[PDB]
Every structure is written in structure tokens, then in C-alpha cells.
Symmetry: C3
């Protein structure tokens, strides 16, 4: 894997160190968490204005079905 | 959900933003972790004085059965 | 459990407090995470020089089989 090795190899010296594997696994996890939250947000925000009003919020709930 | 929408809507402007959903999911998780730990503590602290002595600690263990 | 109670009982007063149980569960988790990451690192670092070169990295990948 090429851009992947370069992405992990942050100081660009050809070697992936322990710190770098650790910083990588760490940010990979953070990114995955954001994407899921955003996707959940976007799905509740039915009109896409970027905020959830009490109505959008109301549909979503109901022993959650919405 | 009413007090719930108000609880998430922290700056009180009627709209639940992404930051607020994120701060909410975050503190909800923190609270759930505390409650479980405390419940586990309270259960080991057999006399409720608020500290676990070596005896209370001893029963609890035993390839944990106590 | 003896060294274990002493390990958790950080200020050495004979009683394991809530803070101490919480600090303990916390560092236990951190240690377990490190050990797994290191073991995964060590396994990719096929020659043990302490860094993963593109070759060691390449074997490891392949719809990961290596
Ligand atoms: Ca590097
Ligand atoms: Ca909206
Ligand atoms: Ca708001
Ligand atoms: Ca006690
Ligand atoms: Ca103590
Ligand atoms: Ca190596």
C-alpha cells in the first residue's frame, strides 16, 4: 500500500515507527467516530439546514422510529 | 421529547447543532461509565463506609465470585 | 489478592477509594491497549529493528494476509 504507507509515515523518512502507528490508529478511530456521528446528524436534519429543530427531533424519536 | 431537546439544546436557541449533539453523546457516555463503576464500587464496599478494605476486596476476588 | 490491593491502594492507607478504583481501571485499560498495539507492531516489524519498512508493511497487507 503506497499513499497509505506515506500517510502513516508522517516525518517522511521511509520507516513507520511505533509512535506513528499509534498516532495513525488513533486518528483513524477519531475520523470513523466523526463520520458516523455526522451521518446520524445529517439523517435527523431532514431539511439539511444544519440544525435539528424540535420537529425533526420529534420524528426521530418514538421508542426511536423515524 | 421535551426536556430532552432542551437538555441537548444547550445555548437555548431552539436548534440542536452538531456541536451540541456531539457534546451530548459525549457526556451521556461519561455518565454511563461513572454509574456502572460506582455501582461496581458500591457492591464491593459491603458496609457502605465509602472505601474497600482488604476483606471486602478479598470476598470479591476468587477467580471472582463474591 | 495482596500486591494487587497494594497496587490499587496508591496512597497506602489500607483503604481502596473510588478515585483509586477509577484510576486503576483507567490505567489497566491503557496498558492493555499498549500491549496489543506493540504486539501488532512487533509482528509487522519482521526483522525487529524497531521500524516498519515498506516491505514489511507490504507483506502484512493484501486484503491483509501476511
Ligand atoms: Ca517515519
Ligand atoms: Ca433542519
Ligand atoms: Ca442550540
Ligand atoms: Ca467498606
Ligand atoms: Ca487508599
Ligand atoms: Ca523492521
Amino acid at each position: 500500500a503506497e499513499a497509505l504507507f506515506k500517510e502513516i509515515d508522517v516525518n517522511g523518512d521511509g520507516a513507520v515507527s511505533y509512535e506513528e502507528v499509534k498516532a495513525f490508529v488513533s486518528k483513524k478511530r477519531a475520523i470513523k467516530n466523526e463520520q458516523l456521528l455526522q451521518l446520524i446528524f445529517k439523517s435527523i436534519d431532514a431539511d439539511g439546514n444544519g440544525e435539528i429543530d424540535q420537529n425533526e427531533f420529534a420524528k426521530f424519536y418514538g421508542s426511536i422510529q423515524g
